[PDB]
Paper text:
While ETEC colonization factors are diverse, nearly half are regulated by the transcription factor Rns (also known as CfaD or CfaR), a member of the AraC family. Rns activates pili loci expression by binding to a site immediately adjacent to the -35 hexamer, which may be accompanied by one or more additional sites further upstream. Rns shows the typical characteristics of two-domain AraC family proteins. The DNA binding domain (DBD) (residues 162–265) consists of seven alpha helices linked to the N-terminal domain by a 3 residue linker.
Given decanoic acid both stabilized and affected Rns function, we crystalized it in the presence of excess decanoic acid, ensuring saturation, to assess what effects this might have on its structure. In the unlabeled structure both monomers in the ASU were in the closed conformation. Therefore, we examined differences between the open monomer observed in the SeMet structure and a closed monomer of the unlabeled structure. The two conformations were aligned using the long helix in the DBD. This highlighted that helices making up the dimer interface and β-strands 2, 4, and 6 in the open conformation are shifted away from the long helix in the DBD by ~ 1.7 Å in comparison to the closed conformation. In both the open and closed conformations, His20 and Arg75 interact with the carboxyl group of the decanoic acid. In the closed conformation the fatty acid carboxyl group is turned 90° allowing both oxygens to make contacts with either His20 or Arg75.
Author numbering:
A (entry chain B): 9 to 95, 103 to 263
B (entry chain A): 9 to 93, 103 to 263
Amino acid sequence: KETIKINNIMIHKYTVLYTSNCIMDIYSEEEKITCFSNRLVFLERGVNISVRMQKQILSEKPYVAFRLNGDMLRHLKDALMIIYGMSRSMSRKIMTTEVNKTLLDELKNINSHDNSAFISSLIYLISKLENNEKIIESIYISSVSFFSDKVRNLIEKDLSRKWTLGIIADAFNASEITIRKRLESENTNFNQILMQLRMSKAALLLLENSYQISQISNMIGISSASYFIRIFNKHYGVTPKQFFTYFK
Amino acid sequence: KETIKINNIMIHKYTVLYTSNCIMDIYSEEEKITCFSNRLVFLERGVNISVRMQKQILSEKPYVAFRLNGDMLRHLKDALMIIYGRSMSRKIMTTEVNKTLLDELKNINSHDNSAFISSLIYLISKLENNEKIIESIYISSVSFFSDKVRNLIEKDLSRKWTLGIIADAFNASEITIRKRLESENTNFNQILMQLRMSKAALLLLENSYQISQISNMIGISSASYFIRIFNKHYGVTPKQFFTYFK
Ligand SMILES: CCCCCCCCCC(=O)O
Ligand SMILES: CCCCCCCCCC(=O)O
């Protein structure tokens, strides 16, 4: 089957996706968005979504994706609040567009080496999109640091340690209630943050195609490679082997 | 004869010039740059240059020019020093505009200022040896005392200005102001003459004001006197200037 359903995908970096040969339904919050043959998808950081996906060509990769790390996105926010001025709807969180001739050829000669060239390519592209406010919005919203973000970074400093709400609540000078309700006010909780951190790191590493599963288990902090396969399958709704075979 | 010599052109706004159909020799300071057919020219604000320029097709305009006012240049400076972190070769720069970047310049509609700053930033991103430009955009984006003097003069171009009026406006003595302007390699009569003569050139290109109106507007009694001053300064008469650029 050239179709795959992947669950609980949480986007940890602002992501721009280009459906190189796939078609995709994005569910997330009891909603749904379709992304057709040749479109661009701008995914706000922090969303949690599920995906149903159709390959066009079976022998090829599903899509092509660009992810903006924390710095780059801070910069894009600043430059955007200089170029346009300074100032809850899943349709204001995930946006598809029709990639034009000039915007496409621009996407061609994008070499993600000169980071400034990338920020500029991205700004010019943003300038050449209609109804573009809703994208500007999602880039500033997802460009602020939340408390779940402080927790996320403290966990990433050593992904494999055995974390508890007790260690985070010691790190931050407050009690476990403080942390469970601040994280609850962000529509998440700590066991889920840890789970999302390990499962994304595992997916990406599995796509690198140069690590045994047991190593990836160890890298994210999971004893058994078979135990890791169970957790991955339960979370994403596919086994690492099928995920890998669909994405290679 | 479709070649023209224009002297003492003083750039009050960061200028990007595209020799749409002309060839041009630029004399900054005892130095010289030639700009071939289809090139871009980045002119640092505050430079004073002289130009000898030859049209390709005569029934058309010489070039196409973009001038960035203070707001826009401040926004460009800020945005540029977020995205990236005395030499007439760092003040006037010509480059080769590629095919694709040329089409980019085409679909430039200077209405959405955000779209224009974006087009400008993408262009700057697509230039080799472009460091020399970012510097000149920051170099020319700070406020000098000649600038404070310029803004006071521009608030009412037609008054009869002297050093005495400026030295009362700013709390200092005429020596203070002549020497603060001196360390900027200018003087007040030059500042005033350059405002009036630039404003006169631009207005003459607008094709909608009698010469007497332009004279009256810049602060010059006579229209025949203004024509004399213009010819003496620019090296052409307003009529020859207009007929060359229309
Ligand atoms: C779009 C379907 C692919 C599965 C998602 C892989 C990891 C999500 C990316 C991220 O963590 O930033
Ligand atoms: C190279 C073309 C120059 C001819 C006209 C110059 C008048 C503009 C003066 C200015 O921008 O401050």
